[PDB]
Design a protein around this nucleic acid. Structure first.
Length: 67
RNA sequence: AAGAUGGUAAGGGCCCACGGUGGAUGCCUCGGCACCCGAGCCGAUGAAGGACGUGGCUACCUGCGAUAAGCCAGGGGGAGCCG
């Protein structure tokens, strides 16, 4: 959804790395707990893999502004 | 008493019906063939062609490559979709 790109265009220098470290953390427990809880997701593994890629496109756009 | 002496089928044949095994003929085709026209090179910014991985659960083809049944901009389209 566009509201993540609403705010992600602002954050230029270094904080966008540690803001996607924790969003990898947020799928680590989903990938662990897809063998016990295992049901109320199937949103959650495939939504996060898209909202990491749409935060790592802008991270290289805002470095090809330099190179 | 001297009779053409004859009616039986472990089994065999010919013909007529009724079923099994087999896959020819008829009718089709998302696949080919031969002539015509539009067109006619990619590559160390690393090619043609491949190995291995990627779906919540996956064996095999297709699509993609650690962002991996995908991401960001521009146009078309107008309604149901997650090969």
């Amino acid at each position: 959804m566009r509201k993540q790109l609403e705010e992600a265009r602002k954050l230029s220098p270094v904080e966008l790395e540690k803001l996607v470290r924790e969003k990898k953390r947020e799928l680590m427990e989903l990938r662990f707990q897809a063998s016990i809880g295992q049901l109320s997701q199937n949103h959650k593994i495939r939504d996060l893999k898209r909202q990491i890629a749409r935060l790592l496109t802008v991270l290289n756009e805002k470095r090809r502004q330099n190179a």
